[PDB]
Ligand binder design. Structure first.
Ligand SMILES: Nc1ncnc2c1ncn2[C@@H]1O[C@H](COP(=O)(O)OP(=O)(O)OP(=O)(O)O)[C@@H](O)[C@H]1O
Ligand SMILES: [Mg+2]
Lengths: 336, 20
């Protein structure tokens, strides 16, 4: 994997150094329906006029981005998305901006969020959870090799494609850093303790997040939950985890090594790096090459009735995207 | 049960990223 990553880094750097810009325009698409929403924007299913292809358009109101102080974060998201390339990372097809908004046009992943399937079904069996987990492990290995930290892992951001494989979306908090950073960001249930304690953290927070994700997928509920964020932080800081009766011995051990407050012990960060995870008993049945190559039998393949079908997504109240005859925040988003 | 306490809680729906 050393040779692969070496070549992949070179490919990344060229794009990180000279990012693409203005590859489309609003009038080239017909906006159809909202697919999902987040704190900073909304994602819509759209159809490209000239090609007839469908895409998922993320729309960001520039003024809201400023108010919520996400300027630098939004610039991070777009610069990173246009430079990466991995089988489990959603593809940025186009990007552009207008007087009022910022746009990121991605490939439409019709299977819906893992979140919806997870809550409906209740929980995923271990082999089922392991299939998704393997893909995230590989994605983090790739991202971390480029000095990138994801920072927002959660079922809501993991889409299922037509083959049953995962496609990671939302790089709103993704950042390229060598060393440590201090931003208090992410989603409450997934924050590593270092983040909450404001001590400064590194890539290891992504590995702790993986632990939370695996736990949520296998249990059906997160390891630390409560009605209010602050109550959740107290549980995370205390650190004591409780496991369902159906969790295998191997799963509980892997988890104790991921949901580990001690950085000198948490898997993924140690000397052997990612191999401590890959070689773990819980993953003994995993063929890492086959997973990467997508040759493994997907345990679940979503129902899809042609292009433009959004049946795997909830419905959302539609909102008219505003326009203005005056350019807003021009200098702030110059590089977008 | 832990499941019942979760299901009866206010955080069973889509969770948004933290925003100041
Ligand atoms: N490529 C895609 N195909 C289909 N749906 C998508 C795609 N990308 C995103 N979505 C949908 O949009 C939702 C959220 O959009 P997005 O991640 O852009 O919001 P956000 O404001 O960045 O979220 P946050 O609350 O974490 O800040 C996803 O959870 C999903 O339902
Ligand atoms: Mg999101």
């Amino acid at each position: 994997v050393k040779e692969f990553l070496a070549k992949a880094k070179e490919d990344f750097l060229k794009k990180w150094e000279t990012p693409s810009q203005n590859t489309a325009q609003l009038d080239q698409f017909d906006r159809i329906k909202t697919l999902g929403t987040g704190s900073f924007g909304r994602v819509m299913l759209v159809k490209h006029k000239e090609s007839g292809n469908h895409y998922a358009m993320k729309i960001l109101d520039k003024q809201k981005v400023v108010k919520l102080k996400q300027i630098e974060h939004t610039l991070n998201e777009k610069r990173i998305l246009q430079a990466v390339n991995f089988p489990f990372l959603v593809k940025l097809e186009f990007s552009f901006k207008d007087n009022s908004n910022l746009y990121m046009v991605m490939e439409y992943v019709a299977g819906g969020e893992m979140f919806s399937h997870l809550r409906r079904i209740g929980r995923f069996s271990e082999p089922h959870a392991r299939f998704y987990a393997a893909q995230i492990v590989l994605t983090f290995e790739y991202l971390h090799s480029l000095d990138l930290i994801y920072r927002d892992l959660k079922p809501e951001n993991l889409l299922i494609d037509q083959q049953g494989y995962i496609q990671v979306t939302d790089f709103g908090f993704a950042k390229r850093v060598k060393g440590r950073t201090w931003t208090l960001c992410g989603t409450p249930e997934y924050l590593a303790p270092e983040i909450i304690l404001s001590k400064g953290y590194n890539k290891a927070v992504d590995w702790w997040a993986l632990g939370v994700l695996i736990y949520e997928m296998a249990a059906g509920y997160p390891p630390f939950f409560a009605d209010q964020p602050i109550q959740i932080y107290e549980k995370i800081v205390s650190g004591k985890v409780r496991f369902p009766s159906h969790f295998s011995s191997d799963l509980k051990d892997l988890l104790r090594n991921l949901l580990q407050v001690d950085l000198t012990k948490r898997f993924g960060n140690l000397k052997n790096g990612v191999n401590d995870i890959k070689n773990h008993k819980w993953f003994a049945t995993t063929d890492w090459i086959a997973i990467y190559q997508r040759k493994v039998e997907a345990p679940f393949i979503p129902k899809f009735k042609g292009p433009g079908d959004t049946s795997n997504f909830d419905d959302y109240e539609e909102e008219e995207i505003r326009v203005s005859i005056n350019e807003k925040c021009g200098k702030e988003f110059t590089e977008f | 049960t832990t499941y019942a306490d979760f299901i009866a809680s206010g955080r069973t729906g889509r969770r948004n990223a933290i925003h100041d």
